Design a protein around this motif. Structure first.
Motif, PDB file in Angstrom:
ATOM      1  N   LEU A   1     -17.248  46.660   9.844  1.00  0.00           N
ATOM      2  CA  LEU A   1     -16.242  45.479  10.170  1.00  0.00           C
ATOM      3  C   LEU A   1     -15.572  46.865  12.056  1.00  0.00           C
ATOM      4  CD1 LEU A   1     -14.276  43.364  11.384  1.00  0.00           C
ATOM      5  CD2 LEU A   1     -12.560  44.123   9.732  1.00  0.00           C
ATOM      6  N   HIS A   2     -15.957  45.916  12.962  1.00  0.00           N
ATOM      7  CA  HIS A   2     -15.527  46.562  14.062  1.00  0.00           C
ATOM      8  C   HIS A   2     -14.972  46.044  15.214  1.00  0.00           C
ATOM      9  CE1 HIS A   2     -19.168  49.532  12.903  1.00  0.00           C
ATOM     10  NE2 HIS A   2     -20.189  48.285  12.922  1.00  0.00           N
TER      11      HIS A   2
ATOM     12  N   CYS B   1     -15.034  50.605  18.926  1.00  0.00           N
ATOM     13  CA  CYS B   1     -13.781  50.687  17.922  1.00  0.00           C
ATOM     14  C   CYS B   1     -12.696  50.786  17.709  1.00  0.00           C
ATOM     15  CB  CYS B   1     -14.916  50.430  16.755  1.00  0.00           C
ATOM     16  SG  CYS B   1     -14.925  50.034  14.748  1.00  0.00           S
TER      17      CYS B   1
ATOM     18  N   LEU C   1     -11.653  50.905  14.364  1.00  0.00           N
ATOM     19  CA  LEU C   1     -11.530  50.624  12.709  1.00  0.00           C
ATOM     20  C   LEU C   1     -11.011  53.009  13.741  1.00  0.00           C
ATOM     21  CD1 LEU C   1     -13.651  50.266  10.142  1.00  0.00           C
ATOM     22  CD2 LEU C   1     -13.121  52.602  10.637  1.00  0.00           C
TER      23      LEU C   1
ATOM     24  N   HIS D   1     -14.279  54.724  12.994  1.00  0.00           N
ATOM     25  CA  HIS D   1     -15.852  55.270  13.800  1.00  0.00           C
ATOM     26  C   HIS D   1     -14.958  54.843  15.093  1.00  0.00           C
ATOM     27  CE1 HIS D   1     -16.798  51.452  11.106  1.00  0.00           C
ATOM     28  NE2 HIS D   1     -17.000  52.776  10.159  1.00  0.00           N
TER      29      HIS D   1
ATOM     30  N   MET E   1     -17.745  56.119  17.553  1.00  0.00           N
ATOM     31  CA  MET E   1     -17.795  54.864  18.461  1.00  0.00           C
ATOM     32  C   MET E   1     -17.103  54.267  19.561  1.00  0.00           C
ATOM     33  SD  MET E   1     -19.061  51.276  16.388  1.00  0.00           S
ATOM     34  CE  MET E   1     -19.587  51.994  15.084  1.00  0.00           C
TER      35      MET E   1
HETATM   36 CU   LIG Z   1     -16.213  50.434  13.258  1.00  0.00          CU
END
Ligand SMILES: [Cu+2]
Ligand SMILES: [Cu+2]
Ligand SMILES: [Cu+2]
Ligand SMILES: [Cu+2]
Ligand SMILES: [O-]
Ligand SMILES: [O]
Length: 476
Positions: free
Chosen positions: A401-402, A459, A461, A464, A469
């Motif tokens: 999930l991003h 992202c 998250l 990440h 990311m």
């Molecule tokens: Cu992500």
């Protein structure tokens, strides 16, 4: 014993010098009767709600009383790069930095949090987060619930885990770099399963998912509906009735819920289809807070119309930007393996049916956008100021999930992970779901950002983000 009352962040306004003072520092908090070192703004954990008004400027004095560097970002606020507080907005330990915010966007619930390069997940996990309440002339005319801490209440929902000694057990490692840091304990404004006494009538909840990596899905224990009146960037054109409300990391929704005498109910979060997130006790609906009705009438209204959402423009001719998210396959494999070895099949519940080899195999730069782990010295591109662009963000290639967030804007979602957005997600948003598929957003940047204080796109998250990311971009 009784549930603790829901803590209410102080609602902070400027002083005669038009200043708001925020101190960042460490202290102790108690969780299930065990003390833990935690970090907060103006206190030991979490932070106040900064109140802003459209068209007025405020100066914020930020004192870093930590012994490590940090940054302070206003998530959801459209401000120039120089005061955006991304990783380049370093505040030295024991130093002060001041910013002037010239607010010019509609009323909304935003938030603020650290953005320290490579360490944002740990810094949020240790306790740092606050809220931003923006008001404008439009919203007060609606006569929504508006008594702070009584019928207008913020609800910052976050998970943590702790070691046996009681301390927060944070780690950025191969497993959490792939699937996120998550825990087994749910906090609501920092408290475990509090109660909130609310007057009879409408209760306004300003929901924030402040987890590092856990997605949430709010509903009520007795299936009364939630009336969504606002998203990340402010009011929807009209209330949207829902029975459940998915909320990604860093997103906000405001909802109204009915409060009736003699009928307490819980706000709960429902198990989600995200790897790792349905481990007990999150394999079942999990209480967030108990709403305790008080036999005093609440005066707020739920108006039939809230605001006017302008039309999407024609899309032909607009710059189309491609943002390909990716995860190094081997560290995705290894982190998922570690998850499965640790928790077993339950780490995929609800989903659809060792030596050192040097610097290129380091998980700290394993997650990427457009083939590159975040490089603070090199914004990836220069976006236009005052022009609508179409940004296309792809997670094809992995199944994590991003929630993708773009600084400096409130955008409109054109496609969310391959589908048109749900109605309550069709308004102003600063986050869009990307999971195994492709999203497209219509964005416009009204302020400048130079290479030295670039906007981030990333992202949310957090593990990440911290392992690469994220990209920087300039505007103007
Ligand atoms: Cu992500
Ligand atoms: Cu942001
Ligand atoms: Cu953010
Ligand atoms: Cu950010
Ligand atoms: O962020
Ligand atoms: O953010």
């Amino acid at each position: 014993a009784e549930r603790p009352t829901l803590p209410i962040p102080d609602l902070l306004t400027t002083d005669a010098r038009n200043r708001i003072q925020l101190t960042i520092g460490a202290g102790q908090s108690t969780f299930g009767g065990k003390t833990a070192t935690t970090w907060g703004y103006n206190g030991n954990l979490l932070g106040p709600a900064v109140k802003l008004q459209r068209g007025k400027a405020v100066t914020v004095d930020i004192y870093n009383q930590l012994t490590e560097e940090t940054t302070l970002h206003w998530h959801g606020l459209e401000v120039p790069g120089e005061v955006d507080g991304g990783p380049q907005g370093i505040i030295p330990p024991g130093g002060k930095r001041s910013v002037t915010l010239n607010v010019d966007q509609p009323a909304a619930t935003c938030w603020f949090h650290p953005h320290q390069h490579g360490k944002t997940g740990r810094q949020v996990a240790m306790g740092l987060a606050g809220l931003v309440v923006i008001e404008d002339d439009e919203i007060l005319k609606l006569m929504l619930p508006k008594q702070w801490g009584i019928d207008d209440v913020p609800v910052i929902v976050q998970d943590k885990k702790f070691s046996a000694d009681g301390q927060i057990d944070y780690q950025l490692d191969v497993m959490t770099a792939a699937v996120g840091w998550f825990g087994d304990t749910l906090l609501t404004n920092g408290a475990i399963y509090p109660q909130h006494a609310a007057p009879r009538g409408w209760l306004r909840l300003r929901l924030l998912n402040g987890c590092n990596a856990r997605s949430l899905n709010f509903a009520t224990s007795d299936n009364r509906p939630l009336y969504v009146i606002a998203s990340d960037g402010g009011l929807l054109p009209e209330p949207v009735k829902v029975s459940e409300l998915p909320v990604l990391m860093g997103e906000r929704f405001e909802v109204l819920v009915e409060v009736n005498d003699n009928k307490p109910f819980d706000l709960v979060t429902l198990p989600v289809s995200q790897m790792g997130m349905a481990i007990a006790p999150f394999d079942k609906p999990h209480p967030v807070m108990r709403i305790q009705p008080i036999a005093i009438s609440a005066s707020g209204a739920l108006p039939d119309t809230l605001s006017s959402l302008p039309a999407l423009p024609s899309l032909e001719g607009l710059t189309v930007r491609k943002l390909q998210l990716s995860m190094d396959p081997m560290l995705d494999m290894m982190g998922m393996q570690m998850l499965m070895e640790k928790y077993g099949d339950q780490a995929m519940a609800g989903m659809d049916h060792h030596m050192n080899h040097g610097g290129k195999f380091d998980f700290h730069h394993a997650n990427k956008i457009n083939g590159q782990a975040f490089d603070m010295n090199k914004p990836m591109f220069a976006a236009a100021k005052g022009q609508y662009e179409r940004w296309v963000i792809s997670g094809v290639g992995d199944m994590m999930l991003h929630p993708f967030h773009i600084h400096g804007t409130q955008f409109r979602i054109l496609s969310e992970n391959g589908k048109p957005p749900a109605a309550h997600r069709a308004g102003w948003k600063d986050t869009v779901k990307v999971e195994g598929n492709v999203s497209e957003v219509l964005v416009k940047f009204n302020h400048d950002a130079p290479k030295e204080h670039a906007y981030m796109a990333h992202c949310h998250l957090l593990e990440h983000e911290d392992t690469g990311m994220m990209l920087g971009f300039t505007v103007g």
